[PDB]
Amino acid sequence: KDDDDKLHSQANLMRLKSDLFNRSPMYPGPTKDDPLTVTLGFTLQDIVKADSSTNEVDLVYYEQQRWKLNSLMWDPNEYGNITDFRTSAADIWTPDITAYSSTRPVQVLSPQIAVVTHDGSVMFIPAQRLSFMCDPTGVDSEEGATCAVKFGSWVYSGFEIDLKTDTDQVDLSSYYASSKYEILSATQTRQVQHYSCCPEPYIDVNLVVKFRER
Amino acid sequence: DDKLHSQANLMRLKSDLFNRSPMYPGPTKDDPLTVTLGFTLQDIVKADSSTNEVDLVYYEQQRWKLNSLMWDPNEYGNITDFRTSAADIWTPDITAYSSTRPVQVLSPQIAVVTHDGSVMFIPAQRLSFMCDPTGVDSEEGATCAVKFGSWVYSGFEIDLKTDTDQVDLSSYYASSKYEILSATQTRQVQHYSCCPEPYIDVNLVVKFRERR
Amino acid sequence: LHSQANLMRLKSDLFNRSPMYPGPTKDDPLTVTLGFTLQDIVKADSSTNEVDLVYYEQQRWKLNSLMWDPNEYGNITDFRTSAADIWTPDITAYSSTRPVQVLSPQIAVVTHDGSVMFIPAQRLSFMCDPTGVDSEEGATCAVKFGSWVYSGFEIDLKTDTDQVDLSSYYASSKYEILSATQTRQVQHYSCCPEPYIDVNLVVKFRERR
Amino acid sequence: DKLHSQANLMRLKSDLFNRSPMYPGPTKDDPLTVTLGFTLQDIVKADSSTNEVDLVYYEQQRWKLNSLMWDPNEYGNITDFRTSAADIWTPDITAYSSTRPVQVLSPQIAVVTHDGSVMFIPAQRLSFMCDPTGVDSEEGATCAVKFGSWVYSGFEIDLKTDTDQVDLSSYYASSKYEILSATQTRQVQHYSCCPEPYIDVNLVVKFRERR
Amino acid sequence: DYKDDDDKLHSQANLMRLKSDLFNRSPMYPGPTKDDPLTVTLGFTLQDIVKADSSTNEVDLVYYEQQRWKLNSLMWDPNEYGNITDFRTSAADIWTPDITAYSSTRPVQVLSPQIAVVTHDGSVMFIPAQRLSFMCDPTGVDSEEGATCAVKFGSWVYSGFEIDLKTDTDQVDLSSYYASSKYEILSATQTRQVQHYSCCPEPYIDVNLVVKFRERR
Numbered sequence A: 001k002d003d004d005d006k007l008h009s010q011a012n013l014m015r016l017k018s019d020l021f022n023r024s025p026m027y028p029g030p031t032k033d034d035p036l037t038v039t040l041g042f043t044l045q046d047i048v049k050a051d052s053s054t055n056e057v058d059l060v061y062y063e064q065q066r067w068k069l070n071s072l073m074w075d076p077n078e079y080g081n082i083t084d085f086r087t088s089a090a091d092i093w094t095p096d097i098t099a100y101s102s103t104r105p106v107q108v109l110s111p112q113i114a115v116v117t118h119d120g121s122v123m124f125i126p127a128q129r130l131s132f133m134c135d136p137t138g139v140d141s142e143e144g145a146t147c148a149v150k151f152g153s154w155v156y157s158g159f160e161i162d163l164k165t166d167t168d169q170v171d172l173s174s175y176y177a178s179s180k181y182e183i184l185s186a187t188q189t190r191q192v193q194h195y196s197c198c199p200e201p202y203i204d205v206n207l208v209v210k211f212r213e214r
Numbered sequence B: 001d002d003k004l005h006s007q008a009n010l011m012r013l014k015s016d017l018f019n020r021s022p023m024y025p026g027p028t029k030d031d032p033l034t035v036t037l038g039f040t041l042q043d044i045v046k047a048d049s050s051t052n053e054v055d056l057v058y059y060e061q062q063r064w065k066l067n068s069l070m071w072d073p074n075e076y077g078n079i080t081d082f083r084t085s086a087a088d089i090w091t092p093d094i095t096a097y098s099s100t101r102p103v104q105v106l107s108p109q110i111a112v113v114t115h116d117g118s119v120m121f122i123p124a125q126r127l128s129f130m131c132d133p134t135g136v137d138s139e140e141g142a143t144c145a146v147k148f149g150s151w152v153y154s155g156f157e158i159d160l161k162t163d164t165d166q167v168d169l170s171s172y173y174a175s176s177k178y179e180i181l182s183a184t185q186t187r188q189v190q191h192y193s194c195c196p197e198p199y200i201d202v203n204l205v206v207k208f209r210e211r212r
Numbered sequence C: 001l002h003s004q005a006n007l008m009r010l011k012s013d014l015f016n017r018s019p020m021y022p023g024p025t026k027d028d029p030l031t032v033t034l035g036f037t038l039q040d041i042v043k044a045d046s047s048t049n050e051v052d053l054v055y056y057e058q059q060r061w062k063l064n065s066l067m068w069d070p071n072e073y074g075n076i077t078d079f080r081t082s083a084a085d086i087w088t089p090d091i092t093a094y095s096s097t098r099p100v101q102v103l104s105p106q107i108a109v110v111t112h113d114g115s116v117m118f119i120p121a122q123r124l125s126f127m128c129d130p131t132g133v134d135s136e137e138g139a140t141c142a143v144k145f146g147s148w149v150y151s152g153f154e155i156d157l158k159t160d161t162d163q164v165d166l167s168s169y170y171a172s173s174k175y176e177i178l179s180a181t182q183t184r185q186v187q188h189y190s191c192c193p194e195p196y197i198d199v200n201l202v203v204k205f206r207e208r209r
Numbered sequence D: 001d002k003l004h005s006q007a008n009l010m011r012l013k014s015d016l017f018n019r020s021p022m023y024p025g026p027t028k029d030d031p032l033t034v035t036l037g038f039t040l041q042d043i044v045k046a047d048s049s050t051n052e053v054d055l056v057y058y059e060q061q062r063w064k065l066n067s068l069m070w071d072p073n074e075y076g077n078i079t080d081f082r083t084s085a086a087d088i089w090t091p092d093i094t095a096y097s098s099t100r101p102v103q104v105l106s107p108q109i110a111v112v113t114h115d116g117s118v119m120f121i122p123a124q125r126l127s128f129m130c131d132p133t134g135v136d137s138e139e140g141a142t143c144a145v146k147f148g149s150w151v152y153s154g155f156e157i158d159l160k161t162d163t164d165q166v167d168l169s170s171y172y173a174s175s176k177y178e179i180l181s182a183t184q185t186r187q188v189q190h191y192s193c194c195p196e197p198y199i200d201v202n203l204v205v206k207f208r209e210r211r
Numbered sequence E: 001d002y003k004d005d006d007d008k009l010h011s012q013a014n015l016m017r018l019k020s021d022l023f024n025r026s027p028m029y030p031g032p033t034k035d036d037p038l039t040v041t042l043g044f045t046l047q048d049i050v051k052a053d054s055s056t057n058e059v060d061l062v063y064y065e066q067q068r069w070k071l072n073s074l075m076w077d078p079n080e081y082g083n084i085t086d087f088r089t090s091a092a093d094i095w096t097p098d099i100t101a102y103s104s105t106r107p108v109q110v111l112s113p114q115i116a117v118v119t120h121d122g123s124v125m126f127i128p129a130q131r132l133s134f135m136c137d138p139t140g141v142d143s144e145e146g147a148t149c150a151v152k153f154g155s156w157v158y159s160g161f162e163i164d165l166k167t168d169t170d171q172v173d174l175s176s177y178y179a180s181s182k183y184e185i186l187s188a189t190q191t192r193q194v195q196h197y198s199c200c201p202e203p204y205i206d207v208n209l210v211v212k213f214r215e216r217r
């Protein structure tokens, strides 16, 4: 029965995914009538490089994203008590969380796979290398340099996508201990932006990093 | 449940526009299109005097209008606009005419479509282009220029316009290595030897110097 | 509306429908006209003897399978289409050192007589010793372009002129062009029984002074 | 005979792949062990300006799925076959402290054996976080990098090594850097993100300038 | 005339029909097996040593790799297809061997169109041009005798009992070597070897490319 249990668990998961993905149309993304709140958090692993000839700095971090869709809900009892599953991020809608002052395309360092839970909640944690606009002047001093970069939806205003953080402290517990740069402070703060282009406000999380040469 | 219906209406709308009608074949002499173009310059990242290439980060505002993208909000739950993958729709082949590397795309390829058939698409880009930065370390600074326009469509198929001749500098990076003295964007009509029909472009002209 | 419908119908008739063109053959050979418009010598690297050019490449050919009567399609005489929608020649630099980087949209123009025009802009790194670039005489380098897999029995080449177009060459390049020629050649590679055709691009250049 | 052998191989691959949906990956109810081993070929570059080191290696991965089992007697005595990695499930084994996307240096083709076991040996170049200070001394420099599933906890994917010794028998003899030691060690981690423990294999390399 | 126009049409039809008969109404070759092994002929044409990096001991080559093999499943009778004796086809339409450099340090960069030639006897010719970075210590390159480096090419996943290799000559073709390269070639050979790797009881086959080169004076 126990290998049949294994076969049944696979059948159940295959069925769940078919039901969620093949027998319901793809979620069209958030709208003003159906807005979404994405929870964003950063785990900073390394400041790899600080280029004073171009004022670009390169970070490596894990970006934790979480949201919840009614359309991704199921009753575990209908599917052999499955409460969550992993799936390619290509299979589901994902928010267009973008750095606002990048100078190169982000490079993805991890597999793009999300965890979907039966309450319709999704957790997706892409590791990234980012080059962004930053003047490292002062990095070779006790006080160090300070740079900042905003992350938010590119195409969705606050009326479609809102953001939140669970804390305003960037997680430094995994920061590389032999980095060329030591972290003096790293914060992540929700902001409401008004851009002259657009009558609607855009929400971002402002990552502010203060750092110096070790 | 109202949220469920809103979703159905939007899915229904996109299906009607995209699955139940063939994608537009692009503009023609009999159905020409005007694309409105504007630039927001964010950074002059690098100026390489060994190769005379300069690297810009900007975003390009593109807007156009297609009758084939129109709908009556009243028959789709009063949906007035939606976001969609740029792959779902026709987009103009707006190209720099003096790039030295392929453009690097810095923003999601997603457009906004409105019920009157208008489309807005705002790609952010890093561009290397032909530019001699001689004088950048002087009070007068350096001046370079780069033309943007359709690669394959003449002025008889795609016209361009700008809403202003001033490049938007309000988001220019205040700690760039280079400060901007001026940045203009100006529609030009060109007659190239190759071709009997005039081509249209927007000439981005930037005057910049080493920040002091 | 009518014009749009006419163009969709034409493309559908040509593509979605009529039997397919499988590329040229000995029994159905093709001539491709090639020309170059040199825009910039970006870089000359004397440590590796590689030089980087930016140019566009004008390609032209004609297929009976792409012909139509404008009168049957509301007097449409040409259209733009994705290069992926049609056959295109495998024109290749014979001495590149890096993959070509494409700088322009991959879209071609098809005309009612069956002619296709395709003008890809490229950045190319190729084998070139720039020795002498810092002298009055300058350096000279050459690179051959032609089909990779089709011999002259399947693809022949020609030029409309042997002068490279320099009328868009960047006036403030690090390098001045002294001359640039594009010349059809016939190659007989001991590798292969049939002759290969190429257009040889020869560029004489020097540091701007 | 040859046409028969081919027809049989085609039939097997059909019955296995196109005659069920791809396996949905491991779960707590249907967990998997990946055996992981490294063969280090070269330390290409050590950058003391950014503290990044570049390694070239082969990563040996092995796992077993009941759903990939067959009776060779039903398929003309076929006991194993090669197939594109895209045709089958593969584990999301990831370096935890890379600084650039891994670059794949070998074909993405696996070997499947009739007992359901799969062997997949991707060659990679990896840049990862490493301070090379001391590389020009007798004791050399030591760096480490953890490899593990990105999204599956130890309750879904276990890892194991057959040996804690990295295979150095193909290490490039004229590298800029010589290897003093290289070990690969299973670890269990408890991350605040996640209630369930994660498993990794920690690669520790001690290296020095080859003089 | 009209006859000539028709002949061309018939030729196009005949080729489309041949490709369809081979590719559409037939199963893609599942690759070689111990029961159905395959011999691939490999040869190199070295065009340039582009660079020699003594800071990392990587050297970069540009070459053409000629590959040839033959399958019964690609055979046809030309008389059944208007005397068509060969055709060009995308390398994606056919099976191709996984010939790989065994000491690359970067992914190979492909410099030519991925198109093969298939002949009515079932033989296939495929000639990818590549830029390769590989492990090579160029110490001595500034000497009369130069530096020597080597790199093995072979199937990644198939042993010698599935994919065997051969050369047609022991000499790398230097007839189109770049005359103004930074490096002159002193010799370049290509030699079949048999390897025994601890992973696997079956022997593996490779062709070893050995190049002796020096800075041009």
Ligand SMILES: *[C@@H]1O[C@H](CO)[C@@H](O[C@@H]2O[C@H](CO)[C@@H](O[C@@H]3O[C@H](CO)[C@@H](O)[C@H](O[C@H]4O[C@H](CO)[C@@H](O)[C@H](O)[C@@H]4O)[C@@H]3O)[C@H](O)[C@H]2NC(C)=O)[C@H](O)[C@H]1NC(C)=O
Residues within 6 Å of the ligand: C071, C074, C075
């Ligand atoms: C598609 O293309 C063709 C063009 O080749 C086009 O067909 C042409 O239509 C024009 C306009 O009707 C025709 O021109 C006429 O020719 C006759 C002689 O045959 C003249 O008598 C006509 O002149 C009178 O009418 C003019 C107004 O139309 C007056 O200005 C003038 O004073 C005269 O009263 C006129 O020039 C022409 O014959 C055809 N040509 C062919 C080859 O058919 C067709 O109309 C185009 N299709 C569309 C939808 O536009």
Ligand SMILES: COc1ccc(/C=C2\CCCN=C2c2cccnc2)c(OC)c1
Residues within 6 Å of the ligand: A154, A155, A156, A195, A197, A198, A202, B038, B040, B061, B110, B111, B112, B120, B121, B122
């Ligand atoms: C007149 O100049 C502009 C400048 C920027 C934007 C859009 C922006 C910039 C702020 C971030 N998001 C957007 C956006 C909004 C919707 C789709 N794509 C991009 C614009 O569109 C209305 C016009």
Ligand SMILES: COc1ccc(/C=C2\CCCN=C2c2cccnc2)c(OC)c1
Residues within 6 Å of the ligand: B151, B152, B153, B192, B194, B195, B199, C035, C037, C058, C107, C108, C109, C117, C118, C119, C165
């Ligand atoms: C010397 O002979 C030539 C030179 C250039 C072009 C095209 C150009 C030049 C630059 C503007 N864009 C085009 C174009 C036109 C149509 C398709 N693709 C590109 C040409 O074709 C009409 C012939």
Ligand SMILES: COc1ccc(/C=C2\CCCN=C2c2cccnc2)c(OC)c1
Residues within 6 Å of the ligand: C094, C147, C148, C149, C189, C190, C191, C192, C196, E045, E064, E065, E066, E117, E125, E126, E127, E173, E175, E176
């Ligand atoms: C000096 O020795 C040579 C010369 C030429 C070629 C091939 C060529 C010439 C360049 C254009 N294409 C080919 C080709 C020929 C057949 C199939 N694929 C490619 C060659 O291939 C191994 C060796």
Ligand SMILES: COc1ccc(/C=C2\CCCN=C2c2cccnc2)c(OC)c1
Residues within 6 Å of the ligand: A043, A062, A063, A064, A124, A125, A171, A173, A174, D096, D148, D149, D150, D151, D191, D192, D193, D194, D198
């Ligand atoms: C110190 O802060 C940490 C530590 C570990 C992880 C996740 C990891 C560890 C590496 C393996 N994969 C994951 C993971 C876990 C869940 C989903 N996706 C990825 C993390 O995510 C934000 C923060």
Ligand SMILES: COc1ccc(/C=C2\CCCN=C2c2cccnc2)c(OC)c1
Residues within 6 Å of the ligand: D039, D058, D059, D060, D111, D119, D120, D121, D167, D169, D170, E102, E155, E156, E157, E197, E198, E199, E200, E204
């Ligand atoms: C010294 O340690 C070694 C030697 C050889 C191989 C495999 C090789 C040799 C190169 C060609 N391909 C393979 C291979 C074999 C089987 C499956 N996939 C790849 C190896 O893989 C972990 C370690």
Ligand SMILES: *[C@@H]1O[C@H](CO)[C@@H](O)[C@H](O)[C@H]1NC(C)=O
Residues within 6 Å of the ligand: B074, B075, B076, B077, B078
């Ligand atoms: C759209 O709005 C109009 C008035 O604003 C209303 O009469 C109509 O019911 C709405 N149509 C819908 C929701 O389909």
